[PDB]
Each structure stands twice: as C-alpha cells, then as structure tokens.
Amino acid sequence: MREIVHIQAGQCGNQIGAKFWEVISDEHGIDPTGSYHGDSDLQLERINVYYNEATGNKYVPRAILVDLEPGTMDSVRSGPFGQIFRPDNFVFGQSGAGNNWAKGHYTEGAELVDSVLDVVRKESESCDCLQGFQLTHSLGGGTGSGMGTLLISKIREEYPDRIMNTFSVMPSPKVSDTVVEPYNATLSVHQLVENTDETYCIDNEALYDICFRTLKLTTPTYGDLNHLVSATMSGVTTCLRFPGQLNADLRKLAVNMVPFPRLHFFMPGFAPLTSRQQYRALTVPELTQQMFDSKNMMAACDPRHGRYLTVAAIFRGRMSMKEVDEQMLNVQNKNSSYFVEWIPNNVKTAVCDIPPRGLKMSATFIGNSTAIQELFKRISEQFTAMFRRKAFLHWYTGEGMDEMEFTEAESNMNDLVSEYQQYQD
C-alpha cells in the first residue's frame, strides 16, 4: 500500500493529466464511472497506487486538479473520463494567470494555494504509506509553471521526506503560445532543481517533430502532442502500477537514477511510434534500436552529445526476456563511449507482461543523460536574448518581482549547465 498522490496544474497540466488517467484507467479496467471491468487480477494488484476505493467497488483517482481559470478544468469534467475525478478535488480560481509566472507564484497563485494543500492533506491523510507526489504541468505558462512550483515548495515543507516527481513540459519557440515562455521556464527550472527528486523533461519541439516527421501528421495539434506524453507517462509508471520482480518505489527509483541531487532531470522515450504499416509485428531488436534512437527521444536532445549517467528501460508485452537482455547488452556493448565508466552497470531493464492498449509490445526509455544540458542551454539563450534588453519585464515587475530575481534564475541555471558539463568529460 504505497500510495501516490497525483496533481495536475494549469492548462497543459490538466489536458495532459486528463489523457494520462484516460490511458491507465483503460489499462486497469476502470470504466468512465470508476467501476472495474477488466479480466486480469494483475490490473487490480497495485490498483491502489493511483486510485482510491470508494463504496460499491468504485475506484476514484487520487488526483487533484488545479488551475487559476475555470475553462480548462470545465472541459475535463465534461470530457471522456471527467466523471471519474473526485468533485472536491477540483480547485480553481477565476482571474487566470495570463501566462505570468509571477501571477501563478506570488499574486493569484498565493491566494489559492492554501486551499489546494487542504485537498492534498486530505488525500494524504487517507494513505496507508504515501510514497510521494507527482506533478504534471508546463513551464512556459503561468499557472502550471508559476503556481505549480509554488505548490511543490509548500508540499516539500509539509512533507519534507516524501518523493516529489514532475512531468514538466518544456517550452519551444516552434510550439509557442507567448514570447515570455523562456522567462517562466527559467524561473521554474531553478525551483525544480531544488524541490524535486525526479523531473521528466518533455520538450514540445520534440513532441512536434515526432508527430510531423515520424508519425507523419501534416498539421499537429496540442492533442496530438498529448497522445505521446500520455503513452510515455503510462510507460514510465509501468514499474509502479503492475507487479514485477522489481519492487520499485519512488524513492528506490530515485536512489538508482539520481547520482547527484541537482542532476535529476531525465529524458523519456517511447517505441514504437508507427504511422498509419501499423499492424506489423515489432521485434525486440527493433524495439531496442528505436528506443535508444534520438528520433524517439522526447527531450529534443541528442544523447550522442553527452553521456548517460543512468538508464532505465521498461519492456511491455509477451516477449523473449532472454532476447531482451541480449539486445540491451548489445546496445551498451556497441556504444560504450556514451555511458559513463564510473558507474558500474548503470543500465537496468524491467519487463511487463501487460502491453499498452493496441500494441503487442512496446518499450519506454528513461535516461539521465548529460545531454539534457542542451535543453537548458536553449532556454538560457532565449531568456538572455530578451532579458538583456529587459523586454517584457514590465509584466513581472508589475506583479511585485524585481530584476534581481531574474538575474539569479539566469545564473542558477547556467550553473546547472556547468554542472552537467563537468560530469560529461
């Protein structure tokens, strides 16, 4: 009974989190009304990790929906599985955040945060042994970014010894809402560096290029991007939601993936990613070659530009586990120049007999690569291009911030990049 409390904040946070619960709810046999209708007891074995059990055998997600405007959450409640979420778990305001980190963190957000902690405390008080929290949000907006990181800061104060995990969508000018996204992203990254144990970095540019080039989607939408994150989120959490000789709790995964407290930002990956030649059976070598290929990486970073500190791959479906080990040991022993030699056996593999819906077998990739520094390098350059001219700063100074706080975020991330550099040589 190692429960996980889920929180989704903001537009991106809630639209992605919605599809996430849609995906795993299907994998566990939970219909849109919370009733179970699966056929394998493996579905219910660890069902209580993400769901509570109400009366009548009803399973209610352990999720807290947060946003500073009603719009996004209203859609979810009216969406496919909107009826499955606890009504009290909807915590929202009306002003909105205006894609302003200061509004989500200091002004609007501060007014609503105490009431979100009221629901978090209520979900925790029902847990037999809380593993920790997981947040899904974007960093370029104002609520998921500004108020999300304010939520983590306060959740880590009331639960200093619980694991704090985040799925964080990183902004990209190619997939942009506003020009202030680097400002918000740089301000959140420093918060995550301090108050998260694991952050899964998800770059919207990678999600977009995968949809255009690999999935062959002429005109990708936000929905299209959210499909990939949904599938990925289901993949990384497979070693949590199902039984296996792993016995992996959030803290155990952190202990074996994070060799240094600040370098806890991961690159996820998924395979296959087929275009509609979609029924063809994918072999184990093919799953492996793709899972480690950059075109299947969702951080928009070339691993061949850095070195892997640790790597964790999960294989789903009925397949030769022997053949699995063979191909994994072939990937490492064919490109050992990209794995650090000072962490013995830093590549681990888990297998799962239950594949995702509609796939005979897949593989989810979780890599702590020093190549992630290229991402923060992008954000830092876009941040400095505007900040040197103080462009758009008035939005933030008007909310109570000072330029000094921006300079600090600037440095605190450049330091982060520098830390990733030394461990890469």
Binding site: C129, L246, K252, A254, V255, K322, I343, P344
Partner: protein, 438 residues
C-alpha cells in the same frame, strides 16, 4: 541438545528462508501444519532436529526462525503461503516503507526505530532454548535492509549474546539479477561494520547460482524461486550436521574451528555437486570420485574464482546419500595427484569428511533431479579474495566521484564512514594476499 535460531533480514533473506524451511520440513518429515508423524515424543524432546524446531503441546513443530523486513510485501507471502501454519504471527516482523537500497536508511534512519522490537522477538525464542548455540543470519549485500539493518542487528546480538556464535549466509551482488546501482556501496559498508561480529560467513554470488541454473537446469532466464530452491540445497548441506545425528560440525562452534583459523578470514568458499536437471528423462548417476572431482571445478562454486591460484586453510567434504569412507579416500588420492591443491605451510594438508546416508531431498515440482549421492565442499581459499577485489573496485569507481553519496549522508551517515569502510576492505584484501601469495 542445543538450539539454533535462524534470522532472515530483507527480501533475499526472507525468500531464501522460505525456501530452506520448506526443505527442512521435507527432510525432517514435517507437514505444513507443523505435524511430524515420526516424532513419537509429542510436545517435547531433545533430538537432533529439535535444534531447529520447537514443539507445542498440540504436536506442532515450529521453526526457531525470525523473519524481518522493513516492508511487508515479502513477508506477507509467508503469512499466507503453504507453510503459513508453521510460524506464529510473532515470528514475522514487517515495516511500512523499506530502505530504498540505502544502507544508511536501513541502519540508522529506519533501523534505529525497529531494532529494539526485533531483539524483543528474538528474546522470545531464546527463552525457549535450554542451551542456545548461536544464530544463522540470512541476508543480502545489496539491499538497504539486508545490508544496513543486518550490521546493526549483529552489533546488538554481540551485546545481548556475547558468548553465542553467529554464522552468515550472504548474497553477493550480481548485475544479471539486480536493478540497483549502489549495491557496491552497501556491500562494503555492511561487511565493514559486520566483520568483527560474524564468526563464519558463506557468500553466495547470484552470478554463480544464475549460471548453474542456466547451465545444469537448462533455465534460460532463472527466477528467484529457481535461485532459492538451489541455495536451500547448499544451505541444507551446510546445516544438516546441526539437524541430524553425527559427529562433524555438531555445533556452530565447530564451524569456526574447522573452517576459520584466522578471525577476519571467515569466508569459506562453497562448491556443490551434482546439480542435474529433473527434465532429463534419466541421468547416469555419478560416483563418489566424480562428484568429489566436481568440487574443484570452478563451474559449481558458489563464488566464481580460481582456487588453484590460492592456498587452502581448511577443507570439509559433506556427503549425502550412498557414500562410504572407502570411496571418499579413493577419490581424494586421485584428486591430489591431478589437482593443484596448495595448502598453507602453517595448516595441515587434510580433509574433514562428513557423510549422511539420506540423499538430497528434492522439492516436488522443483528443478533439481533426485540423485543418489551428492557432496558440498567447504574450502577456505585465498582465492575468494577475488570477490572482494571486484566489489572494492566498483566501490572505487563510484566513490571517486562521490556518486550517490548524498543519499547516504542525507540519512544521517557521515561521509567518513565510507572511506573508513573502504580502508577496512583494503586491509581485508591485504590479509588474504599475505596468507596465500609468496
């Protein structure tokens, strides 16, 4: 008759313990309900099996065992398993959240709060003993509980039972069946703080058990059940003398006498044979000399090393089945004339031999085939130091970068305890080279 209290710490210890007592029951003729038809003395008796089993007035034979894990998933299997009736609920101790492979967590953070409860439950078994010999501690090197909480229990056992002996059955970390990257740290930490508290330690390297399962049992990807059913065969061979009538290794003290001439060098290598796949229609049964000859093949050693390039300090041959002393000496003679068995000049060049006529018991539905005769060789070679070398090297590669050290320091451990632990292993590796090399 003197009693032996077995202690199982962590997942590896608990599951291995489950596999052994399953075997002890099949061997001693005990049913899952604790009933023993052959035991004519009901609810009492000072027989050789009573060293591991007590008896209730209702005729139940209850293991003298304690299961401890900082997380309840593994031990919940014992509570509802086949032999759930053997133990009473007091024998099974479980926690809420485990140690997350963090030695500092199982020893300090979490161990400090549960140590006094485990000792209390053990004291309940001691109070049923008329002359408690010692303890048999089963644990893993890599686990945060098995490594971190074990070393704390050992320190406290040396305090509450100063004159009692303590043997170990330790699982050496093998990448092929592990997802932990920090297992080298834990191993070197638990060996340092446990070294002066364990009188004799049998190390089993999963890498060795893994290949023995793939090679002999034709198992392409062995599970823990396979690895454990085999380890409880070796453990059975090493504990049989304490559970059966005999004269060799009749008490836990004899293990330190016959196998450990030097205190720190208390890690005998174990070799077992034959391991035959049951799926083989019918196997030609091996002779006393062939199974004894196998005891010097690196293939069936519990730790892969080259004993030829070491020096034996002691040597025990434990036979089970159709073996008479004549055959043993015949094989030994031929083996000395063909094998490279270099002893230390300050130790006799000899072999102690134990024979039990009951052949190895096989678990119905298991992997091992029923053989007419088998043997387990307990030899104390400097060659086992190869294991410490591999491990100490992996420790050095990570520690040079302080990788993962923040997790240990975060749980209250000082960074100095790392180097202090490492420096002890630098001394341990030195004691082995001084005794073997010229």
């Amino acid at each position: 008759m003197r009693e032996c209290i077995s202690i199982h710490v962590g997942q590896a210890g608990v599951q291995i313990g489950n596999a052994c007592w399953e075997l002890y029951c099949l061997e001693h003729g005990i049913q899952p309900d604790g009933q023993m038809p052959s035991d004519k003395t009901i609810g009492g008796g000072d027989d050789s099996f009573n060293t591991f089993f007590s008896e209730t007035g209702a005729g139940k034979h209850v293991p003298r065992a304690v299961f401890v894990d900082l997380e309840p998933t593994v031990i919940d299997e014992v509570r509802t398993g086949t032999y759930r009736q053997l133990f009473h609920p007091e024998q099974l101790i479980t926690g809420k959240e485990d140690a997350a492979n963090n030695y500092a967590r199982g020893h300090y953070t979490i161990g400090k709060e549960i140590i006094d409860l485990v000792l209390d439950r053990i004291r309940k078994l001691a109070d049923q003993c008329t002359g408690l010999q010692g303890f048999l501690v089963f644990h893993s090197f890599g686990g945060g509980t098995g490594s971190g909480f074990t070393s704390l229990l050992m320190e406290r056992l040396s305090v509450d039972y100063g004159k009692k002996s303590k043997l170990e059955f330790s699982i050496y970390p093998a990448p092929q069946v592990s997802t932990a990257v920090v297992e080298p740290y834990n191993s070197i930490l638990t060996t340092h703080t446990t070294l002066e508290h364990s009188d004799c330690a049998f190390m089993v390297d999963n890498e060795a058990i893994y290949d023995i399962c793939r090679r002999n049992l034709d198992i392409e990807r062995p599970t823990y059940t396979n690895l454990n059913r085999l380890i409880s065969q070796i453990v059975s061979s090493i504990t049989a003398s304490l559970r059966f009538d005999g004269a060799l290794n009749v008490d836990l003290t004899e293990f330190q006498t016959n196998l450990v001439p030097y205190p720190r060098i208390h890690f005998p290598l174990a070799t077992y044979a034959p391991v035959i796949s049951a799926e083989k229609a019918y196997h030609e049964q091996l002779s006393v000399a062939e199974i004894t000859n196998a005891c010097f093949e690196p293939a069936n050693q519990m730790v892969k090393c080259d004993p030829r390039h070491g020096k034996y300090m002691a040597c025990c041959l434990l036979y089970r089945g159709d073996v008479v002393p004549k055959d043993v000496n015949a094989a030994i003679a031929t083996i000395k004339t063909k094998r490279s068995i270099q002893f230390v000049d300050w130790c006799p060049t000899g072999f102690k031999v134990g024979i039990n006529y009951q052949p190895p018991t096989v678990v119905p539905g298991g992997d091992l085939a029923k053989v007419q005769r088998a043997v387990c060789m307990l030899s104390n070679t400097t060659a086992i130091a190869e294991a410490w070398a591999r491990l100490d090297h992996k420790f050095d590669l990570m520690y040079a970068k302080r990788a993962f050290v923040h997790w240990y320091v975060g749980e209250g451990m000082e960074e100095g305890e790392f180097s202090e632990a490492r420096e002890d292993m630098a001394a341990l590796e030195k004691d082995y080279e001084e005794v073997g090399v010229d």
